[PDB]
Each structure stands twice: as C-alpha cells, then as structure tokens.
Amino acid sequence: MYEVVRVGELGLIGEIIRLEGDKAVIQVYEETAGVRPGEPVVGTGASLSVELGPGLLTSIYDGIQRPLEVIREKTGDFIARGVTAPALPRDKKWHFIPKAKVGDKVVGGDIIGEVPETSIIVHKIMVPPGIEGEIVEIAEEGDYTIEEVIAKVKTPSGEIKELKMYQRWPVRVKRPYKEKLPPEVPLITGQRVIDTFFPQAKGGTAAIPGPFGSGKTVTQHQLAKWSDAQVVIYIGCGERGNEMTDVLEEFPKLKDPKTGKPLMERTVLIANTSNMPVAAREASIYTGITIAEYFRDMGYDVALMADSTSRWAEAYPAYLASKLAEFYERAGRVVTLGSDYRVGSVSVIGAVSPPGGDFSEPVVQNTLRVVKVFWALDADLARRRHWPAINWLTSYSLYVDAVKDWWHKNIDPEWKAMRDKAMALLQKESELQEIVRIVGPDALPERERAILLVARMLREDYLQQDAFDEVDTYCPPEKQVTMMRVLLNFYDKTMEAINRGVPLEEIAKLPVREEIGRMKFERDVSKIRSLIDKTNEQFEELFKKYGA
C-alpha cells in the first residue's frame, strides 16, 4: 500500500509505530523507533524539523522547507519542486549585533543579538527553548555565516552549549510560550466591513471561501499587505494554471505599501503544487505555523495565510479534522519565552474550498467548527458589483466583544454601539427587501423608504471599499469611526425629519449626500468629521423650508 515510491517525502509504514517521514531512503522520526524494522529503512535520532534563523525572509520553500527548484514552462509557464539543499544559505554573511554580555543570566527565548535581515525586518537572535544559564562567551559586532558560534552558555549543571544565529525545531511540536492571552487586540486590516463588522483578533482564526476569484485574490492580497502584522507567512502558490508562474518574479516587485520596499522582505512563501509529494503538502501547514511561531517569539505579530485544496491517502474525516483543530489551536497571542515581558501573536487566515464547489462536507463541513471568523465572499455580491464581495448577513466574527474595548479606549467610545446600530439597519433592510419581493415597493411608508435609503448609503458609502484607489485602499481606524458617525448621524436626522413631515424625496436629494458618498476618498479625517455639522445645518434648512 505504498504512496509513490521514489518521489520526495513519504508517510512511513513502520512495525508497531505508524507515521514517520523519509526523503530518500533515510527516514526521520516522529515516534521514537528502534532501528531497521524492515526494507532498508536505516532511521535516525531526528524529528522532521525546520531551521530558524537569518535566511528565511524572501525565501520560497516546499512544505518541508526545501528551497525551490524553478524549471521552465510545462503546465503553462513554470513548474517547481523541492530540491534537497540547505534551508538557510551557509555562504551568506549576516551582520550580528550582540545584545548581551559575558556574565548575563539567560533563559530560552532571551534575545542575545540582532541581525538586519532585510530592509524591513530586524531578525532577533534568541536562546533556543530549554537552554538556560550564564553567557560565558559572546561574539562581537561583525559579519558571520549561519554556522558560526555566536555565543556559549554554561547551564546551571556546568554544561556548555554552543549557540548559533539559527536553531532547529520540530514542526509538529508547538513552540512553547509563557501564556496564551485571551483575544483582545484587533488585527487592524484597514478594510471597513472586516474591521467593523467581522473583526479578526491578533492571534485569532479566520476562514474565507476557497478560491474562485470573486475578488478573493484582491481581498486576500489586501489582507497580506495592510493587516498590522510585521511578518507574513504565506502557504499556497499551487491551485494551478500559472499561479506558481505569476508567484515567481511577480512577487519580487510587489510593494509593501507601509515602506515601499518589496513585500517579500517580510514574507516567507511555502509552495504546494500538483507535482509535489502528497506528504510534503500535508506537512506544509506545520512548517508554516512553526516559522510563524518563531517570529511571534521575537515579539512580532505574524499573519499566517494558507490556501490550498488538499488530496487523499490510502490507509477520511474520522480522527482527522481533529488534527486540523491541532493546526488551528496553535494560533494565538502569547507572552513569549524570555526574561523581559514580551508579547507576539500568530493570526491565521485560511481559504477554504469544498469537496468541489459545494459547501457540503470535508473541509467546509466544519473547518467552521474551529475558526472564530468567517468572511463569506459571495458571487452574488460580485455580480452586483459590491466590493469587496463580503456577504454581511452570512459572515460572522466571534471577536466583536473581545476587541470592543480596545476600540472604545483607543479610538471611539461608541464603536460597538455604532457597529450594532448599522448592523440592525442592514438586517432590517434585508427583511424589508424580502417583503418587497412578495408585495412590491409601492405601499412602503416614508419611514420604511427612509430606512432603505440609509441602508443603501451604508452599503455604498461604507461596506463598499475601493482596493484600487490610492486613498480608499486602506482605511485607518479613526477614519472608520468618523465615516460611521457621519452615516449614523444622517440616519438620526433622516428619521427625525420624516417624523416632522419633511418628504423623503427632499432628504434623498440633500446635497451633503453626495459628499457622504465620496468621503471614503477623502484622506483628511477632519474634513469628513465636518460633514456632521454640514448635515445638521442642511436638515435645518429643511426644518425651515418646512420640507417640500
């Protein structure tokens, strides 16, 4: 019941112990064996690991951290496979800056040096987990290759351990930390529908529908560039045609808009393709999440974005999906290992596409059992040209209460009240739209028509957001709450007006409305805020002219 015999990594048969990984004929451990139990499987004392140090950023790997092997134009333009070579370059020289001194007491996680790895990210050099003691030797500022010993620690026993810039860690063991903090700080994405209605917490878990392209690449791309994570770990590239080919030397000119340096300078790509061994694709999320863990341990917030559609074996949702829970449970914001109090997080965003188009079973069945956020990209919205195409009735976030306090204290004391009010308004619109479908629009009283008018302005002026516009591609939190306050105040005035005999027609054509429709293009938040007063005075003129 073999896989493919002589391609890549493989899930090993055994004797009394079920799963281990190969590469070649030499096998690495998961369950500690007791060597040669069969057909020349010689074994070793090593887990499927990952190397973690200066070299990771800008790299592309397969699912077990093999560097990518290019290979020209087969499927359409490019086809790639993992070549067995060092994960981190042995020949490159890094600038090491010491951060401890001979005599310092250290623990796993303590930062003992810095390395500027790219123009964007200072890599932090940490004592590996489970090593502690006195620093007895540390390297001076200078340039070193990854294999150079940059420090030595004497453990309380007297044992001397040699520390390098990199470290190794088994991908299947969660990296330890002090404590996992409850969701509390939003991952600010700059996208209004998400930040306002379906927030993601730093350290939370979110799903978005697999890949069609109902603007999916667009919002997935907005999330990658704008979320306030310093580092992105991206798993995908497969899903073929020529995704792999547009991932190669298109990704090298994508800009990180926060610096205008290339985005690959805080990114690490793990590639899953049709031709890669099935067991390297299975392994890829553990490889990815371990790398993500390793940057949180430095105190970075990291966004792990995954996206594949993964095949089947010969040994399906039984004890599995409990193992996918595994993967998801390693998302979180933590107090890291170290002597200093320090916090980092890994937030997880996974694309999820069905047994084949139908949101019925395997993955879709209930990945939704574990994720706390679902942004339901919706082809009907894409056809109604409402972008991004996030359905505001079927999407949900379980983080609204967890994050409201950060919003209240830092941004606007009324964030959650406004959010709830706008949602109640969208919900009412939806009910009214159903009714009008049966009986038609002609008998709608003024009040109901006013609610449809204000809901349409919410949809158009707030939910819709233009990712291609130089201003509206990102919406800072302060801008979000000010736009919301403009809309809600217009709502208040609209029902007040109507409550006084002003016809709805006169409100529909108030001149401020056109200004409200363009506010998302205005970069000066104080100008947007000024629409509150301008709406008040206009309505006032209508209380004067008594409404006609």
XYZ file of C-alpha atoms in Angstrom:
548
model
C 0.000 0.000 0.000
C 2.898 2.325 -0.971
C 2.486 6.005 -1.994
C 4.631 6.940 -4.939
C 7.808 5.011 -4.108
C 10.686 7.225 -5.331
C 9.380 10.834 -5.163
C 10.045 13.328 -2.304
C 8.979 12.702 1.323
C 6.687 9.766 2.364
C 4.496 8.602 5.294
C 6.372 5.524 6.599
C 4.767 2.088 7.094
C 6.619 1.025 10.384
C 6.329 -2.101 12.614
C 4.350 -1.206 15.795
C 4.764 2.578 15.131
C 2.627 4.214 12.375
C 3.964 7.501 10.884
C 7.490 8.694 10.049
C 8.988 10.749 7.244
C 11.541 9.806 4.616
C 13.275 11.886 1.960
C 15.448 9.367 0.008
C 15.692 6.019 1.870
C 16.951 7.619 5.156
C 13.959 8.095 7.492
C 13.410 10.724 10.235
C 11.484 10.211 13.453
C 8.049 11.005 14.700
C 7.565 8.048 17.038
C 10.973 7.052 18.517
C 11.623 3.639 16.889
C 14.453 1.111 17.491
C 16.098 0.954 14.028
C 15.846 -1.346 10.923
C 12.320 -2.870 11.282
C 12.161 -3.676 7.520
C 13.161 -2.957 3.874
C 16.408 -0.936 4.173
C 14.929 1.764 6.475
C 18.003 2.806 8.496
C 16.402 5.591 10.621
C 17.876 8.380 12.778
C 17.617 10.367 16.059
C 15.963 13.333 14.344
C 12.494 14.764 14.006
C 11.108 16.412 10.872
C 12.363 19.857 11.753
C 12.771 23.356 10.317
C 15.759 25.690 10.507
C 15.031 29.073 12.037
C 17.442 31.905 11.604
C 18.692 34.605 9.202
C 17.781 33.369 5.726
C 14.025 32.764 5.996
C 12.638 36.042 4.700
C 12.260 36.350 0.920
C 12.636 32.547 0.664
C 10.333 30.180 -1.134
C 10.092 26.617 0.064
C 8.110 23.444 -0.390
C 6.187 22.074 2.677
C 9.245 20.760 4.476
C 11.395 23.819 3.924
C 13.320 22.736 0.777
C 14.395 25.715 -1.460
C 12.508 25.996 -4.682
C 13.644 24.451 -7.925
C 12.476 26.717 -10.815
C 12.050 24.568 -14.010
C 10.718 26.259 -17.170
C 7.292 26.198 -18.886
C 5.390 22.882 -18.655
C 1.857 23.393 -17.125
C 1.700 26.890 -18.673
C 4.860 28.896 -17.798
C 6.673 27.463 -14.677
C 6.704 24.212 -12.671
C 8.506 23.850 -9.312
C 9.595 21.032 -6.998
C 11.552 20.896 -3.699
C 15.314 20.340 -4.161
C 17.213 18.961 -1.139
C 19.608 21.715 -0.048
C 20.269 23.933 2.998
C 17.139 25.941 4.043
C 19.202 28.887 5.198
C 22.196 29.853 2.971
C 25.540 28.779 4.513
C 27.614 31.170 2.404
C 25.838 34.441 3.131
C 27.299 36.828 5.751
C 24.990 38.463 8.291
C 25.566 41.481 10.383
C 25.374 40.269 14.030
C 24.868 42.856 16.763
C 25.347 41.499 20.314
C 22.686 42.306 22.885
C 24.030 40.524 25.932
C 27.313 40.398 27.778
C 29.609 37.836 29.400
C 28.101 37.250 32.829
C 24.373 37.722 31.791
C 21.848 35.143 33.038
C 19.610 33.941 30.190
C 16.627 31.702 29.558
C 15.064 30.150 26.499
C 13.717 32.985 24.377
C 16.077 35.720 25.627
C 17.364 37.877 22.844
C 21.094 37.840 22.659
C 21.630 39.592 19.355
C 20.135 41.397 16.341
C 20.610 40.898 12.565
C 19.183 43.312 9.946
C 17.966 40.631 7.545
C 16.119 42.768 5.043
C 15.449 46.495 4.922
C 12.234 45.947 6.777
C 12.863 43.251 9.430
C 15.438 43.088 12.151
C 15.777 39.352 12.901
C 16.160 38.777 16.681
C 18.634 36.119 17.821
C 17.147 34.077 20.644
C 18.344 31.456 23.061
C 16.619 28.172 21.915
C 13.819 26.889 24.128
C 15.018 24.791 27.080
C 18.521 26.289 27.263
C 19.394 28.496 30.244
C 22.446 29.502 32.247
C 25.266 32.103 32.152
C 26.608 33.579 28.960
C 30.273 32.744 29.079
C 31.163 33.777 25.514
C 29.539 36.125 23.046
C 30.637 37.244 19.526
C 31.491 40.924 18.876
C 29.635 43.042 16.352
C 30.597 41.738 12.930
C 29.725 39.541 9.994
C 29.081 35.827 10.333
C 27.781 32.856 8.334
C 24.930 30.879 9.875
C 27.110 28.053 11.132
C 29.358 30.383 13.278
C 29.054 30.060 17.039
C 27.929 33.477 18.277
C 27.681 32.581 21.943
C 28.219 29.936 24.560
C 26.036 29.317 27.626
C 27.009 27.443 30.771
C 23.917 25.733 32.155
C 23.402 25.522 35.953
C 24.832 21.929 35.683
C 28.070 23.299 34.197
C 27.368 22.098 30.703
C 28.469 24.461 27.924
C 26.087 24.807 24.942
C 27.059 26.496 21.737
C 24.556 28.967 20.297
C 24.306 29.908 16.646
C 22.120 32.502 14.833
C 19.729 29.774 13.796
C 18.081 26.968 15.686
C 16.135 23.853 14.772
C 12.671 22.922 15.855
C 10.344 20.026 15.113
C 7.419 21.313 13.042
C 4.916 19.062 14.824
C 5.594 20.414 18.272
C 4.043 23.778 19.061
C 6.719 26.197 20.037
C 6.341 26.884 23.756
C 5.495 30.225 25.303
C 4.614 31.561 28.800
C 0.891 32.003 28.399
C -1.717 32.364 25.690
C -3.604 35.629 26.141
C -7.362 35.933 25.513
C -8.352 37.628 22.275
C -8.125 41.334 22.861
C -6.345 43.464 20.291
C -7.827 43.602 16.762
C -5.721 42.727 13.791
C -6.429 46.008 12.012
C -6.795 45.215 8.308
C -7.897 48.629 7.108
C -10.947 47.081 5.387
C -14.175 48.594 6.810
C -16.507 45.639 6.555
C -13.981 43.421 8.285
C -12.647 45.745 10.965
C -16.117 46.987 11.821
C -18.480 44.008 11.424
C -16.358 40.829 11.411
C -13.147 41.717 13.271
C -10.165 39.481 13.437
C -8.323 39.426 16.782
C -4.490 39.341 16.893
C -3.901 35.611 17.432
C -7.337 34.642 16.087
C -8.534 32.267 13.381
C -10.458 33.208 10.241
C -11.664 31.389 7.156
C -12.565 32.848 3.745
C -14.074 30.772 0.838
C -11.500 28.711 -1.073
C -10.502 30.092 -4.364
C -12.866 31.180 -7.029
C -11.945 34.808 -7.598
C -14.963 36.838 -6.506
C -12.329 39.385 -5.813
C -10.694 36.823 -3.469
C -7.103 37.425 -4.721
C -7.867 41.116 -4.258
C -9.069 40.992 -0.651
C -6.595 38.173 0.239
C -3.920 40.494 -1.142
C -5.257 43.487 0.810
C -5.123 41.439 3.979
C -1.486 40.405 3.262
C -0.252 43.992 2.723
C -2.294 46.007 5.142
C -3.005 43.927 8.282
C -0.853 45.244 11.228
C 1.362 42.088 11.268
C 5.073 42.740 10.793
C 5.642 39.402 9.082
C 3.567 37.301 6.705
C 3.913 33.546 6.230
C 2.067 32.545 3.020
C 1.217 28.988 2.016
C -0.242 28.359 -1.419
C 1.013 29.019 -4.951
C -0.436 25.642 -6.164
C -4.138 25.833 -7.179
C -2.649 25.856 -10.594
C -2.731 27.075 -14.124
C 0.050 29.621 -13.728
C -0.291 30.810 -10.119
C 3.229 29.426 -9.489
C 4.442 31.348 -12.557
C 2.830 34.630 -11.508
C 4.143 33.890 -7.993
C 7.636 33.778 -9.497
C 9.182 37.147 -10.360
C 5.808 38.957 -9.923
C 6.089 38.642 -6.140
C 9.570 40.249 -6.271
C 8.100 43.595 -7.334
C 5.026 43.692 -5.073
C 5.410 46.553 -2.707
C 4.785 46.632 0.971
C 2.796 49.906 0.990
C 3.856 50.745 4.512
C 7.509 51.222 3.307
C 7.542 50.957 -0.469
C 10.237 48.304 -0.070
C 9.368 44.942 -1.616
C 6.807 42.918 0.250
C 8.972 39.744 0.044
C 11.246 41.391 2.597
C 8.775 40.439 5.404
C 7.383 37.363 3.717
C 8.118 33.619 3.606
C 6.362 31.543 0.950
C 5.635 27.866 1.253
C 4.528 26.351 -2.108
C 2.158 23.423 -2.627
C 1.918 22.186 -6.245
C 0.205 19.291 -8.137
C 3.546 17.553 -8.675
C 4.951 17.796 -5.170
C 4.703 14.657 -2.990
C 1.411 14.487 -1.059
C 3.231 14.224 2.294
C 5.181 17.453 1.712
C 1.890 19.212 1.121
C 0.308 17.759 4.280
C 3.398 18.845 6.206
C 3.362 22.406 4.854
C 0.994 23.953 7.389
C 3.205 22.689 10.291
C 6.287 24.027 8.559
C 4.455 27.325 8.069
C 2.966 27.646 11.536
C 6.367 26.772 13.137
C 8.050 29.561 11.177
C 5.162 31.899 12.223
C 5.605 30.790 15.884
C 9.282 31.595 15.626
C 8.667 35.173 14.580
C 5.999 35.691 17.300
C 8.601 34.506 19.828
C 10.643 37.598 18.813
C 7.612 39.790 19.713
C 6.296 40.199 16.129
C 2.692 39.883 15.182
C 2.534 37.470 12.337
C -0.156 36.673 9.810
C -0.208 33.134 8.565
C -2.157 32.810 5.281
C -2.973 29.383 3.920
C -4.971 28.491 0.902
C -4.547 25.019 -0.573
C -7.154 22.289 -1.535
C -5.528 19.048 -0.320
C -5.821 15.424 -1.587
C -6.333 11.921 -0.099
C -4.423 8.857 1.145
C -4.537 5.037 1.273
C -4.591 3.998 4.968
C -11.046 10.368 5.891
C -12.687 12.902 8.265
C -12.555 10.347 11.168
C -9.715 11.230 13.622
C -8.713 13.943 11.124
C -10.177 17.479 11.303
C -9.418 16.894 14.989
C -5.908 17.129 13.640
C -6.855 20.277 11.677
C -8.041 21.587 15.077
C -4.491 20.763 16.100
C -3.183 23.230 13.496
C -5.700 25.954 14.398
C -5.051 25.685 18.063
C -1.510 26.983 17.570
C -2.861 30.357 16.545
C -2.756 32.833 19.479
C -1.295 35.974 21.016
C 1.198 34.934 23.703
C 3.510 36.136 26.362
C 6.674 34.654 24.887
C 9.574 32.844 26.495
C 12.143 35.321 27.833
C 13.287 37.316 30.788
C 11.590 40.535 29.582
C 7.798 40.640 29.398
C 7.074 40.235 25.754
C 4.045 39.578 23.513
C 3.802 38.288 19.902
C 0.973 36.549 18.049
C 0.133 34.359 15.073
C -3.181 35.080 13.395
C -4.454 32.503 10.953
C -6.359 33.190 7.738
C -7.344 30.067 5.761
C -9.046 29.967 2.375
C -11.500 27.044 2.321
C -12.827 25.420 -0.917
C -15.343 22.424 -0.756
C -15.213 18.706 -1.803
C -15.557 20.524 -5.169
C -17.620 23.734 -5.342
C -20.311 22.629 -2.872
C -20.066 23.941 0.727
C -21.217 20.482 1.885
C -18.606 18.199 3.502
C -14.915 17.505 4.223
C -13.123 20.877 4.742
C -16.221 23.146 4.596
C -18.242 20.541 6.635
C -16.611 22.139 9.697
C -13.295 23.861 9.483
C -16.083 26.221 10.582
C -16.072 24.254 13.846
C -12.812 25.876 14.913
C -12.443 29.221 13.231
C -13.840 32.196 15.014
C -14.163 34.418 11.968
C -15.773 33.743 8.547
C -15.661 36.323 5.779
C -18.145 34.906 3.233
C -17.069 36.049 -0.204
C -20.203 35.785 -2.273
C -20.570 35.571 -6.070
C -23.962 37.311 -5.970
C -22.288 40.305 -4.450
C -19.543 40.122 -7.064
C -22.209 40.142 -9.790
C -23.954 43.100 -8.143
C -20.508 44.756 -8.308
C -20.397 45.330 -4.488
C -16.721 45.124 -3.466
C -15.292 43.651 -1.575
C -17.842 40.897 -2.022
C -18.252 40.097 1.693
C -21.787 38.980 2.498
C -22.749 40.943 5.614
C -25.558 38.525 6.626
C -23.759 35.157 6.438
C -20.317 36.341 7.647
C -19.546 36.323 11.384
C -16.867 37.135 13.930
C -16.828 35.851 17.494
C -14.341 38.543 18.370
C -16.628 41.583 18.459
C -16.853 41.614 22.315
C -13.178 40.633 22.734
C -11.984 43.679 20.796
C -14.576 46.345 21.557
C -12.614 47.606 24.494
C -9.509 48.337 22.516
C -11.727 50.404 20.123
C -13.515 52.172 22.973
C -10.325 53.174 24.752
C -8.155 53.982 21.814
C -10.392 55.158 19.008
C -14.054 55.860 19.752
C -16.110 55.293 22.905
C -19.099 54.362 20.741
C -17.598 51.890 18.356
C -19.660 48.833 19.299
C -22.922 50.811 19.706
C -22.491 52.270 16.249
C -21.473 48.957 14.783
C -24.616 47.319 16.282
C -26.873 50.098 15.110
C -25.557 49.828 11.497
C -25.930 46.077 11.557
C -29.532 46.377 12.888
C -30.117 48.695 9.953
C -28.650 46.197 7.384
C -30.734 43.423 8.940
C -33.927 45.469 8.654
C -33.147 46.288 5.045
C -32.844 42.597 4.314
C -36.248 41.833 5.917
C -37.828 44.679 4.032
C -36.265 43.501 0.741
C -37.845 40.048 1.258
C -41.251 41.614 1.912
C -40.986 43.869 -1.117
C -40.142 40.847 -3.202
C -43.601 39.425 -2.449
C -45.786 42.537 -2.374
C -43.736 45.123 -4.243
C -42.376 48.635 -3.314
C -45.364 50.895 -3.895
C -47.076 50.857 -0.474
C -43.912 51.365 1.532
C -44.445 54.150 4.059
C -41.973 57.038 4.289
C -40.352 55.552 7.341
C -39.550 52.298 5.518
C -38.336 54.084 2.428
C -36.090 56.153 4.728
C -34.604 53.001 6.179
C -33.924 51.685 2.616
C -32.278 54.995 1.696
C -29.998 54.996 4.764
C -29.173 51.293 4.354
C -28.215 51.880 0.665
C -25.873 54.681 1.796
C -24.357 52.287 4.380
C -23.775 49.679 1.667
C -22.375 52.120 -0.910
C -20.576 54.633 1.339
C -19.223 52.204 3.936
C -19.271 48.462 3.152
C -18.018 49.020 -0.413
C -14.385 49.946 -0.459
C -12.154 50.545 -3.360
C -8.915 48.496 -3.104
C -7.549 50.156 -6.331
C -7.831 53.706 -5.049
C -4.795 55.441 -3.579
C -6.796 56.648 -0.552
C -9.521 54.012 -0.109
C -7.134 51.061 -0.399
C -6.656 51.474 3.372
C -8.990 52.988 5.914
C -7.400 53.911 9.267
C -9.489 53.158 12.412
C -10.032 56.890 13.188
C -11.389 57.299 9.667
C -13.683 54.274 10.027
C -15.414 55.536 13.139
C -15.737 59.067 11.683
C -17.377 57.807 8.481
C -19.679 55.607 10.616
C -20.588 58.635 12.762
C -21.421 60.591 9.652
C -23.733 57.912 8.403
C -25.486 57.238 11.705
C -25.965 60.936 12.341
C -27.628 61.221 8.892
C -29.834 58.280 9.809
C -30.827 60.028 13.084
C -31.628 63.185 11.166
C -33.467 61.322 8.466
C -35.968 59.705 10.907
C -36.238 62.966 12.818
C -37.025 64.834 9.627
C -39.533 62.275 8.494
C -41.069 62.493 11.966
C -41.849 66.102 11.191
C -43.417 65.804 7.756
C -40.338 66.524 5.502
C -40.795 64.291 2.419
C -38.224 61.575 1.862
C -37.596 62.926 -1.681
C -36.111 66.096 -0.162
C -33.770 64.094 2.021
C -32.751 61.907 -0.900
C -31.540 64.952 -2.738
C -29.897 66.755 0.159
C -26.605 67.994 -1.202
C -24.489 66.548 1.657
C -25.419 63.018 0.487
C -23.192 63.310 -2.500
C -20.465 64.369 -0.082
C -21.168 61.355 2.126
C -20.810 59.074 -0.933
C -17.263 60.439 -1.591
C -15.979 60.566 1.951
C -14.054 57.259 1.579
C -11.826 59.108 -0.968
C -11.078 61.931 1.410
C -7.739 61.491 3.200
C -8.295 64.344 5.733
C -10.384 62.881 8.531
C -11.301 66.310 9.922
C -12.989 67.193 6.675
C -15.037 64.039 6.886
C -15.939 64.883 10.518
C -17.184 68.273 9.330
C -19.932 66.544 7.354
C -21.709 66.019 10.688
C -22.270 69.804 11.091
C -22.943 70.292 7.381
C -25.668 67.549 7.556
C -27.128 69.264 10.644
C -27.385 72.702 9.021
C -28.786 71.279 5.764
C -31.504 69.367 7.589
C -32.079 72.627 9.472
C -32.799 74.478 6.211
C -35.446 71.764 5.633
C -36.998 72.259 9.003
C -37.146 75.904 7.784
C -38.488 75.454 4.234
C -40.803 73.064 6.102
C -39.854 70.327 3.579
C -41.311 70.337 0.069
